[PDB]
Amino acid sequence: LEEAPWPPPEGAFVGFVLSRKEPMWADLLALAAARGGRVHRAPEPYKALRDLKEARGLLAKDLSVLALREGLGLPPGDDPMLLAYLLDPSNTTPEGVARRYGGEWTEEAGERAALSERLFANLWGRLEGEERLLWLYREVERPLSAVLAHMEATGVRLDVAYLRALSLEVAEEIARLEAEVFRLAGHPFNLNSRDQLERVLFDELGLPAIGKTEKTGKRSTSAAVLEALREAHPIVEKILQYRELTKLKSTYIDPLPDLIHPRTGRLHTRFNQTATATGRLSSSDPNLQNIPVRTPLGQRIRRAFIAEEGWLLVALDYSQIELRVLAHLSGDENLIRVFQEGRDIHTETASWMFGVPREAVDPLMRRAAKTINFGVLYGMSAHRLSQELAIPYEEAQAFIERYFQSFPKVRAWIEKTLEEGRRRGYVETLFGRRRYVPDLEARVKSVREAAERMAFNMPVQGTAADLMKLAMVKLFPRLEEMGARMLLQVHDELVLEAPKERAEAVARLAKEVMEGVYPLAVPLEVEVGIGEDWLSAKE
DNA sequence: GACCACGGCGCC
DNA sequence: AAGGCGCCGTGGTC
Ligand SMILES: CC1(C)C=C(C#Cc2cn([C@H]3C[C@H](O)[C@@H](COP(=O)(O)OP(=O)(O)OP(=O)(O)O)O3)c(=O)[nH]c2=O)C(C)(C)N1O
Ligand SMILES: [Mg+2]
Ligand SMILES: [Mg+2]
Structure with missing residues (x-):
């Protein structure tokens, strides 16, 4: 609360304001630090960075990354966000964490420093009692943040000249596909507009609608619909290809080269x-x-x-990895026995699926099997299976069934995991990372059963x-x-x-x-x- | 301009 | 109703 001259004592918490959210690209507008009841605002932020031993406070990694960009070896330390996130992973923003644990995320560095200190005191007290969350903090998350800061500041090289050339090639293919689509439709339209495509496919052409969209109930034109419609009309395949090329061009080929940092010549993610x-x-x-x-x-x-x-x-x-973790969490003997003997499950499923031997399984077979063992594992309805392989039922019931007959302890582990989640209000990984899943007790089946698929998946994905x-x-x-x-x-x-x-x-x-x-x-x-x-x- | 919801889709 | 993400264009608001 009391203005004190920069610099702060050791152990202060920092607040800082960036001109943009990405620390590799931001100008450090202001910097302050708070300890006990004093706030120290630095007259020249960049200069002020030099006097810090570590970046301690809300979003510490962001400041550490910026410091690294300027050639200062300033590591992040305590961050109230990490404490809050271990307590409850729904704690994802400083805005939310501040509202919940005792302050307000503002746009002023000194207020962010003071907020950092306060929130750390309150969250530390909440987290001190919890041995395993404390262990995760000190042994995983807090040092991991220093590792991530270095990864971010380092970046990864991109072959720009290569991508610009690829752009033109794909642009000309896109032109061939859209012209061909317009010819088949009998007129041009904005092929990027799924509303306009819907009308062309299902109103103008006589194509049958297969599904509807979730929020507004339009007739869907997703890849899954199109794939089921591929042999109904030649325009469909062209549209699938168009969708692939424009997706990849708009999201990767064109933006990535423009994100190369001028100092490093590299791409810097967050x-x-x-x-x-x-x-x-x-x-x-x-x-x-x-x-x-x-x-x-x-x-x-x-x-x-x-x-x-x-x-x-x-x-x-x-x-x-997630199957290995499943073997461990569930203690299923057959599963454990598969990995102990250096065997491969995805491969074996690909085998089963394509009517092929173990020794023969194109990698495309495997990749197909991969989302099928995971799909089934995580509550894929026997129904949606049908439309992955072919004709059910008992071809799908008994696939999902044979699957669980093979590894019985898994079903038990799932039910066990759901029961504990209902009673406690949360599930947890092998190390005690927890996720609160209140909807396990919903009285609407579709909501409750969605909750259940989220709940029993978390210990597996979370342990990995x-x-x-x-x-x-x-x-x-x-x-x-x-x-x-x-x-x-x-x-x-x-x-x-x-x-x-x-x-x-x-x-x-x-x-x-x-x-x-x-x-x-x-x-x-x-x-x-x-x-x-x-x-x-x-x- | 900037932001939003939506549908759609890339990876693990 | 497999699980977990972030980003894109369109259509529209402000
Ligand atoms: C885009 C691409 C290539 C990626 C896909 C995927 C996925 C998926 C990944 N995972 C989870 C479970 C996985 O354990 C963990 C890591 O998954 P991978 O490394 O791809 O598998 P894994 O390690 O089991 O086996 P390898 O021996 O590495 O081969 O993440 C899922 O839960 N669902 C998926 O669809 C599919 C198959 C959809 N793809 O076409
Ligand atoms: Mg893997
Ligand atoms: Mg992988």
Whole structure:
């Protein structure tokens, strides 16, 4: 409350105002610090950064990232957002956390510093009692924020000249597709407008509508509808292709080259640390956790992500991670037995599906099986199965049934997990990360059963996220020792960059750290690839 | 301009 | 009604 001259005493909390939300791109407008009942406003923010030992307060990682951009090794420390998010993962914004735990998120640095201190006191008290949440804070989230700050500030190289050239190629293909669509429709229209497309497909052409949209009840034109309609009229396939090319061009090919930072010549995402219900990170501005890889054009975009000249990318991927976690949480003996004997479930399902042997399973088979074991696992109705393979029932009941007959303890674990969630109001990961799911007790079946699929999924997806975050915290100092860089995390994958002659040693070490992160009832196995670009590194 | 809801869709 | 995200264009408001 009392104005004191900059600089603040050790241990102060910082408030700061940025000209924009992305710290790699922002001007530091103001900087203050609060300790006891004094607030210190720095006359020259940038200068003032130099006097700090660490960035401590709301959104600390943001300031640390900016400091790193200016060549200061200023790490983030305590952040009330991380405390709030461990207490309840619905705590995602400083606005929400302040309203809930005792202040108001304003636009003034001194008020943000004082808010940071107050909220930290109140949240610390709430979190002190909780051994496992405290453990997650001090051993996972708080150090992870320093790791993320360095990843953000470091960035990842992009082959711009390559993408500009790809843009023109795809633009000309898009022209061929839309002209062909307009010819079949008998007139031009805005093919990007799904309202205009709806009228053309179902009113002008005689195509049958298959589904309706959720909020406004229009006849849907989604890929799923179109796919069911593909053999009904030639325009449909053209539209599917048009949709793919314009999606990839508008979201990746065109924007990415314009996001290259002028000082680094790289792409700098944001790793949002308090943004998901399950404990996963999210990525934005740009999102680098959803770069294409599935289709041919998608792979071509993936190739644009490259190593520094003289370095290589190293991509590490936990194998069947959520199934391994499921084996451990449930203690199902058959499941555990599959991984203990180095077997592959996705492969075996692909086998089963395509009428093929284990030894023969195109990777496209596997990828198809992947979202089927996960789909089924997480409450996919026998119904929607029908429209993944073919004719039910008992072809779908007995598929979802054989699935659970194989691993009976899983059903038990699910019911057990739901029951505890109803009584306690929350579920939790292996490490005690929790998610409150109040709708487990809803008296409307569709709402309640949606709640249930969210609830029993969280311990599985959340444990895998705990495991990866813990692996990042352990791995990071080893990397800097070896002169390598951690660049990206994509949920259960890590992408590193290393000097060519160190690349294999780094891969090898990183793989071992990730597999031994926290021994379970089943081994964790990590596939690793090395390449000059992200695509070739994932093999 | 900036923002919104919606439908749609990229990845894990 | 598989789970978890963030981003895009359209159509419209302000
Ligand atoms: C876009 C792309 C390529 C990605 C897809 C997906 C997905 C999905 C991923 N996951 C969850 C569960 C997973 O454990 C964890 C990580 O998932 P992957 O690494 O892709 O699998 P996994 O590690 O099991 O096996 P590998 O041995 O790595 O192969 O995240 C899901 O719950 N649903 C999915 O559809 C599908 C198949 C839809 N795709 O076409
Ligand atoms: Mg994986
Ligand atoms: Mg993966």
